[PDB]
Design a protein around this ligand. Sequence first.
Ligand SMILES: C[C@H](O)[C@H](O)[C@H]1CNc2nc(N)[nH]c(=O)c2N1
Ligand SMILES: C[C@H](O)[C@H](O)[C@H]1CNc2nc(N)[nH]c(=O)c2N1
Ligand SMILES: CCCC[C@H](N)C(=O)O
Ligand SMILES: CCCC[C@H](N)C(=O)O
Ligand SMILES: [Fe+2]
Ligand SMILES: [Fe+2]
Lengths: 308, 308
Amino acid sequence: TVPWFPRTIQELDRFANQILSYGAELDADHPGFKDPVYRARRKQFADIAYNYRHGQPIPRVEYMEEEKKTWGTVFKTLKSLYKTHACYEYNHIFPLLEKYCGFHEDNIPQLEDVSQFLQTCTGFRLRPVAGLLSSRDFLGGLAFRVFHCTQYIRHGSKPMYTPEPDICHELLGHVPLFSDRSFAQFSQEIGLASLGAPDEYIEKLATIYWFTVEFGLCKQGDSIKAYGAGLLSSFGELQYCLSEKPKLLPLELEKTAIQNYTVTEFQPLYYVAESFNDAKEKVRNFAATIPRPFSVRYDPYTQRIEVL
Amino acid sequence: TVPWFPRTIQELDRFANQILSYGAELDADHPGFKDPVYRARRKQFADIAYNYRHGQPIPRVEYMEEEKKTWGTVFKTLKSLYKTHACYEYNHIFPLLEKYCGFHEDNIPQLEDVSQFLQTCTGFRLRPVAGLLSSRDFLGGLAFRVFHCTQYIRHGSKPMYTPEPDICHELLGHVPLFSDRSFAQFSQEIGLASLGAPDEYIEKLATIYWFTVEFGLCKQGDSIKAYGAGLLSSFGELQYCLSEKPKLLPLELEKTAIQNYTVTEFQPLYYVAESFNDAKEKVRNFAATIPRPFSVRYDPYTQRIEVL
Ligand SMILES: C[C@H](O)[C@H](O)[C@H]1CNc2nc(N)[nH]c(=O)c2N1
Ligand SMILES: C[C@H](O)[C@H](O)[C@H]1CNc2nc(N)[nH]c(=O)c2N1
Ligand SMILES: CCCC[C@H](N)C(=O)O
Ligand SMILES: CCCC[C@H](N)C(=O)O
Ligand SMILES: [Fe+2]
Ligand SMILES: [Fe+2]
């Protein structure tokens, strides 16, 4: 039987409060989670996301000094690395975010402003959430060009890497490409294909998504660049992904989709795509093979799903 | 050379304040215009439209007793006539407007609520204007699914008919069909085809629009119904259009487009379409023949026109 899936933008609110994690709360390598002050902050951001409702303007927040320092450190360090580590597409968009969206080392962008910016770029919009959502829900959101974005920031003790999708990851890793017309359309396409699909196909898509959109590498001329949002938000893993430590393999969905991966440490293996465009094509083609007893059509004027 | 045309929703504001009229200010048959109290009211509604800007919420207004009585008289009388005079499509939608949009004889709908309603139905939205806009501008608006709507009401001395497109005409005549998916798409299509087109094609389209969308009649089974917004808002002309007085001719664009028409009195002649659907098809086909040194594509996610 077919699982329930949202058919309207307002319906996405149904699962908005269903949060998960990568299970690092007890990780001795990630002590930031045990920090009572840190937890108290997460609680504050969670409440905002819990009381939020579709359409509403995203509440502006006043970050603490620690959080501001973390952002600046992450920002300035990554900006330096992007010059030689990030793919062409990313580097061409980043300047625009800095000039028209307030992306600076001494300023944490407010989600409301980023959402307004994305809307004018590609119609994508932000939806604040307490934390990590399931792959089915997150992907479902993409169908309506909605990016469920966190608002809290990683613990200041380890800005180089965090397992969780904090604001740094959402803004520096995902937002840039969501502002691109082609990538935006690509994102919505796979999201549309996931609606009401069997979980065995959802998890498979999630794995493919992980090895491409999240931690993917691609050839650019005779060099290798990073385009995965998880690499682009971690100055620690960004250095590593192009070093001699990790293992590299050609991107092949049949193998990639069944490949194992870590969610609390640097990836031991990465898949290299012939090009950033070939990656999108490959993932798009697989998404179209996801079987289901029906077809879907999205009407942007009413923002509703049509089941055919 | 190609005339300027809006490429974004915000750009529509450029001509928003350019108002016209059907030149009845000196008509001895329409003395309501000379009424100083009436003029003072028009001035009030005009200022609201003049200070309005894209995106902004449409200001709510408090109508006077006279205006409320006029609406009730127009509403109750037309509702009675629709049962036997209005096309099937219209009568099927009207009930919904009454139940979900506040269309009642003892209540003049606020444009903000109507706009919100239309948006959920087909994505169409209202844009308050001081009065009659040129055909080029009005049609241009349709390209972005924007209906420039008046907010003032006809003079209470003659509720049966008015040359101007008052709120009664906008709400009772146009809104109903704009809430229909198929008609909405039809409207946007012709609007898209008008952008930057030579005026000789614009005026020709306007004439066709006048004899169909505004004062068109269509066969429904073995009977004849009215679907034109101008007939549906005038209980005076609604009675007349199906009487023995007017002259009827089969809808034929080649002749219709070059046919003369009045803008201050009941139409002496009407064109009958084989069906409400055939009318849409005919007008859509003609619109597609409008020549121009370029093609246009509308992106609903960014609400911008793409010149190809
Ligand atoms: C689809 C894939 O699982 C991806 O990693 C999703 C999972 N859930 C998420 N949840 C939130 N709030 N933010 C994200 O960026 C993601 N990433
Ligand atoms: C396109 C055709 O000219 C049509 O009659 C337009 C003209 N201008 C208009 N202007 C306003 N404000 N409202 C209308 O309904 C119309 N109708
Ligand atoms: C899926 C979230 C990945 C987050 C990434 N490890 C970072 O530190 O930004
Ligand atoms: C084009 C406006 C037509 C208005 C119509 N004559 C009416 O009285 O409602
Ligand atoms: Fe991510
Ligand atoms: Fe009209």
